[PDB]
Write a protein that binds this ligand. Sequence first.
Ligand SMILES: CCCCCCCCCCCCCCCC(=O)O
Ligand SMILES: [Cl-]
Length: 133
Amino acid sequence: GMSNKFLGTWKLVSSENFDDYMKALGVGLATRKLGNLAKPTVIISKKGDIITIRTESTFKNTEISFKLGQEFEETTADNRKTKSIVTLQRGSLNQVQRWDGKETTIKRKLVNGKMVAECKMSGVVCTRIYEKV
Ligand SMILES: CCCCCCCCCCCCCCCC(=O)O
Ligand SMILES: [Cl-]
């Protein structure tokens, strides 16, 4: 299933077009000002068939535990309450979030030993790169 190369503790090192992505989610300015300044660290772990993705930052922390391909309630860092699913496509980890008839996706794939996360919303595209510790 999911590559054990994902398991570990990743540190963000680059964000591209994050603001426009947050605006597309309806995030207020003042909140964005801190989001753009944030440098989260992501911890991915598994217990059996359950995967957990934790996000730690000075501003907000998050955590989702899920089985692949099974819908699950999620609370995003901007406090959206979504019905999310995580799929596996060509070794990429694709998280979708549905709420209020709106929809966003966060695709996570490994590239040359780095985790790359693409966030798409209303045509906007974010690209955040993480480095293993
Ligand atoms: C995780 C930092 C929180 C920033 C402040 C909340 C506003 C943004 C909420 C949605 C961001 C989702 C992007 C996740 C991308 C990643 O894997 O780093
Ligand atoms: Cl931080």
